[PDB]
């Protein structure tokens, strides 16, 4: 069987590669944080996709569907709560990860792009948080949208144009909810996934930073 | 174990570029990958599911575009920026400082290349700035939960 | 309740160190079981 596959995919190569890798002794437990973060992201994906089978992204039925998940969906409460808690954890873990990286200088030449990509991911993550809280269309999430979504008008010229793109028009309405859902369940994932891939690829290419 | 062979030109070459560190030490597989990873992933799952059960998510009140909650706060991680905003006069100067963060962060690797070191003890100024910056961020954050009047001193 | 968060905070610091410690505790036992 291995034969069958190895004879047309060369499992070996992959295997052999995975084996060749070593973990140098300067690798603390703190070096697990990047991966914990990743673990949190994956949890978010699963847990998030799951609510996609119940949540309704419209001003008229959003708050309701969320409640339904909390009250009728099997383990619906457990799922949402996990999505909620794990989102907070992803951010916190990310912060700790940065701490680790900074206090080991793992960002100094090379790896500079590894850090840059990271910061972008940091933004995506934080972005996930904001769009997320708007979905149930509750007082907090709402006003949060209003405020954040407004900030951009401070830029001359383009400012207003941007606010309207983010709100799908003047003021926060359904369109805002609509675009936001798309951002949370389609764009941000896509984007994050992309940069996360770069982070990983580069990390793999250059190996962990050195000792001390 | 497997010590690095500083005789090998290949390795020396890498060490020069700051690489090859993943070529010595303990095998990654199955040692960490197959055995430890699950341990960490499970620990993580436990902790999160723990919190989820004991402290479930709450529903708010439906959005009312005609009434803004009196006590309206952002997510904890925004607390610092939030504070900067309410505490700073200009509406622009405030927003700039905000953007400054990610902007400046994404700079560190470049405006900190003159020094070839990693260990914090061989990077005096950096250590100070980090520590320094940490207090500032934490302080501002805690402050955002206080009344604008006293937030900048936390009533002290 | 600012005491509560400070409490919770300190608690985590506590839990963390205890954990690591018990870690070495085991390592030590393994060692002795040598």
């Amino acid at each position: 069987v291995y034969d069958w596959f190895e004879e047309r995919l060369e499992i070996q190569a992959i295997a052999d590669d995975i084996t060749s890798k070593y973990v140098p002794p300067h690798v603390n437990i703190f070096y697990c944080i990047g991966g914990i973060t990743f673990t949190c992201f994956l949890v978010q994906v699963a847990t998030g996709f799951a609510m996609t089978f119940y949540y309704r992204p419209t001003v008229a039925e959003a708050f309701a569907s969320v409640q339904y998940i909390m009250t009728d969906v099997n383990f619906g409460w457990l799922i949402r709560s996990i999505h909620r808690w794990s989102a907070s954890m992803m951010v916190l873990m990310m912060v700790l990860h940065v701490f680790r990286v900074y206090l080991t200088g793992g960002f100094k030449r090379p790896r500079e792009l590894t850090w840059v990509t990271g910061v972008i991911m940091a933004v995506c993550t934080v972005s996930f948080g904001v769009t997320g809280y708007s979905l149930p269309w509750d007082q907090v999430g709402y006003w949060a949208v209003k405020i954040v979504t407004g900030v951009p008008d401070a830029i001359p010229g383009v400012g207003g144009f941007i606010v309207e793109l983010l709100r799908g028009g003047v003021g926060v309405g359904q369109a805002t909810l609509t675009r936001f859902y798309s951002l949370h369940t389609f764009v941000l994932p896509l984007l994050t996934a992309v940069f996360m891939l770069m982070h990983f690829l580069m990390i793999r290419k250059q190996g962990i930073s050195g000792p001390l | 174990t497997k010590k690095p062979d500083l005789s090998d030109p290949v390795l020396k070459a890498k060490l020069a570029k700051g690489m090859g560190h993943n070529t010595y030490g303990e095998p990654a597989w199955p040692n960490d990958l197959l055995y430890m990873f699950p341990v960490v992933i499970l620990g993580t799952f436990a902790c999160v599911i723990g919190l989820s059960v004991l402290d479930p998510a709450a529903m708010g009140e439906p959005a009312n575009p005609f009434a803004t909650p009196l006590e309206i706060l952002p997510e904890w991680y925004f607390y610092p920026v939030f504070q900067i905003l309410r505490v700073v006069p200009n509406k622009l100067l405030g927003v700039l400082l905000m953007a400054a963060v990610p902007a400046g962060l994404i700079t560190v690797p470049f405006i900190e290349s003159i020094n070839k070191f990693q260990n914090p003890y061989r990077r005096p100024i950096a250590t100070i700035l980090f520590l320094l910056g940490t207090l500032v961020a934490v302080w501002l954050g805690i402050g955002s939960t206080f009344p604008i009047d006293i937030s900048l001193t936390l009533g002290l | 309740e600012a005491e509560f968060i400070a409490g919770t905070a300190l608690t985590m610091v506590g839990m963390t160190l205890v954990g690591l410690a018990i870690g070495f505790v085991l390592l030590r036992v393994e060692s002795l079981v040598e």
């Binding site: 703190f30 701490f99 206090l103 907090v140 001390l212 | 904890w76 003890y121 | 985590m12 610091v13």
Partner: peptide
């Protein structure tokens, strides 16, 4: 609205982590 427990966890782990990092970093320094 403030999330006490969460905040507790944050304010707790942030320092204990930073500390550990300086500790391991020190150990290597010697």
């Amino acid at each position: 609205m403030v999330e006490p427990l969460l905040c507790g966890i944050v304010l707790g782990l942030v320092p204990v982590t930073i500390a550990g990092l300086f500790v391991t970093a020190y150990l290597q320094y010697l």
